[model samples]
Target: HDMAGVKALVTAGGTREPLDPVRFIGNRSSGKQGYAVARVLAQRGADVTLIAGNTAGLIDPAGVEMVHIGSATQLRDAVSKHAPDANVLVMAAAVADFRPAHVAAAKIKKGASEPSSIDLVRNDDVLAGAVRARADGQLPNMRAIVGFAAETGDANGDVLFHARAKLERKGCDLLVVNAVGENRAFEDGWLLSADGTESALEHGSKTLMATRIVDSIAAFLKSQ
Candidate 1:
């Protein structure tokens, strides 16, 4: 049997939180890491479903399943509905922390005499929701739950220290932390340990990053 049995689900890309019909807020995540993770899972024979957010035109191999979403709310609903049946769930998508408090029916116009301010509301924490689902026995067989933390490095106590706390708070088996800095992470890609040590994977393709992450996942499964 495959390590993940028959199925696994991963959430990827950065969700766009709408401000109006024409304008919205979003992140710079290219869906590379999530895409990579899903690819590696497929290599191990798991039936993979990628719940992608606002990313247009992602290529899925012959056997992988792709579910597209535009906003954080959509992604949350999709993940909650699908994650229950999967053996593993990876929250790799960089979802928007907040969404527009009110979506304007028409495009917001810019006037020279006025300033604009759009109110925002928080989006569901998909990672925390998945953890709660497992905790409440909704998905009793849920084998492993992993979360990703994208840190900008300015925080005290180092990256892994915060990562560990997040793992505890999110109730996941593992948490991968990437510390952002001038030359690494974000756009350049990097290798980060479960404990928070980081090694720059400069020039490494997203696919390669995915393979490395899967290797770690496989090892974690074996150890259990």
Candidate 2:
């Protein structure tokens, strides 16, 4: 019954989907924000577990556990394993939406005689799984779950339209809408909250962004 004695599990970085043994598909995630979120949670006295994907420059919070992963499949499995025990969960990783349907065991060299093309298939829906787990009493003790959306166009209309729908579909307490553009969101190092009334963090550090986000989370949790 102690509100401050909760635990959190966070996922960070971008999951790479392998096209072949030598080559794969991934994103440009630096895992900066995710690491900061873990650090923030730990600083507030919550037990923290970070499931890190393929990224560099990760920091070890004073009292946090870290689990490393590389692909979308690994991240899905890791989230399922840890989410049940977490009081709160935040998914900050930019997981690949698709992967090669069949991975080539050996590298396929592009020769003058051969064409280079790989067929992709949809990856596991980790977000949906989190929602299902929460609804099915799997994460019965869970207090809150947060999801993130990074949009490429129409900062407000595009991201919010989907984010609001996702908040209902994913059944999470909060959904952060991050607009992707010049000097904002991805690696430009700032987080934008979706609440219309709040002021945006134009060019703050990830740590500062995390503090703002956690404070918001605390406020929302208190309301519930």
Candidate 3:
């Protein structure tokens, strides 16, 4: 299927919140899956813009426009700027929930009286913002908003339970849920729609998973 006229905006990688000039709070995301999604969307003929965070060592795809970013605030700004014109928005970046309240001007020295605690503040919810924008008619061209949930199941319940709650909370059209732990993330997951539909995502390469996701997005667009 072709996505010739569709405009896709994807965010990938992990946001880093600075504590000092040399120290930061970050996650373990490699940005591989997000990059694959962008590449596949481009291959399917969409005009793609990738807002990338701190990727490990991945190179940019051939046909996608790249916007490099580091912190959660930058990611939010980039997404907000591009979302108005996007037909599809994928929030694949592992955005930091909290950031340091104050960034030290220089590297924090480890003296005998090193600070033991850092004050943190909440970061903007990019996906929630996009959903709100679409609902408020700010994003007239946005047909669907996709969110990624990287979660871990505990003794309370399974991955899907939490993912479902998040899907409802986020108010996105589609949610890609991954059960992440040691050697788990970037491997497999499921797709949950807001309309109470669920689809199993087979364990495979990130490119394969991306193709499946784009297929869903294309089908959704066609229906609209």
Candidate 4:
């Protein structure tokens, strides 16, 4: 595939839901995988916009437009703005499921005003929204929408079970599932496609996974 005409929208890192002026809930994402995806796609001649959040100490990939963000709302806005003209979307960022219902104006003190329980509200499902928007013909030029998920087994279902469900529910062209847990190495899982195709992603470095991921995106584009 000649990627010279491919305009990509890739999101990296993890969103932070702030609780106050100083403290917030964050994740462990190093933004390595998304960065690699942006790097490789640009190297392949795609016009790329890398929308990122909480990617501490990471350099911006060359030949790409970088949009720095903090909260999931910011990420959503950036995606909405950039996605209309995109050829494909790789939603690699770990967006928070919930955010503080009320953010305190000042730093929460450890004394009398300390919160015993924090109120929470759901954040917008950025990935799902993108897929739905494309289906509704908002992103007319977008050829594919890819989503990533980190899952662990529970009483409800196993890793693949939940991942497959998510793939269907989100309606993305592909879902890259990563095995993640308290002590899991965060190495690999599977690539599940909307066309009922599934492939095992063997354990490897993030860059290795990025190449596989980008390859899948290219294959999907060819089909489109």
List ranges where model 3 is wrong by over 4 Å.
179-188
Tens digits of per-residue lDDT, candidate 1, 165-188, equal 666677677666662223256552
Model 4's TM-score against the true structure: 0.93
**Alpha-carbon error at 124 in model 3, in Å?**
0.7
Candidate 2: misplaced stretches above 4 Å? 1-3, 154-159, 179-203
Model 3, range 1-224, lDDT digits (tens) per residue? Answer: 37898888999999999988788999778888888888988888889999999985788888898999999999988988888888889988889999999997998777788558878899999888878877988887989888888768878878778788899888998888882222456334788977798997877677778888888788787777
Listing every candidate in turn, what is its Cα RMSD in Å to the true structure after a full C-alpha superposition?
3.6, 3.8, 2.4, 2.6
**TM-score for all predictions?**
0.85, 0.84, 0.93, 0.93
lDDT for model 4, please.
Answer: 0.84
Greater lDDT among 1 and 4 belongs to: 4
Residue 184 in model 1: lDDT: 57
State the lDDT of candidate 2 residue by residue for 65-183, as single tens digits. 88999889999889888878888888888999889889878888778875867788988888788778778877787877777776554655654455555566666666666622233
Error of 1 at 189 (Å): 8.3
Give the range of the ten consecutive residues with the poorest summed lDDT in model 2.
Answer: 188-197
- Candidate 1 deviant stretches above 4 angstroms: 1-4, 155-157, 179-203
Model 3 accuracy (lDDT, Cα): 0.84
On the 0 to 100 scale, the lDDT of residue 218 in model 3 is: 81
* lDDT of model 1, residue 51: 91
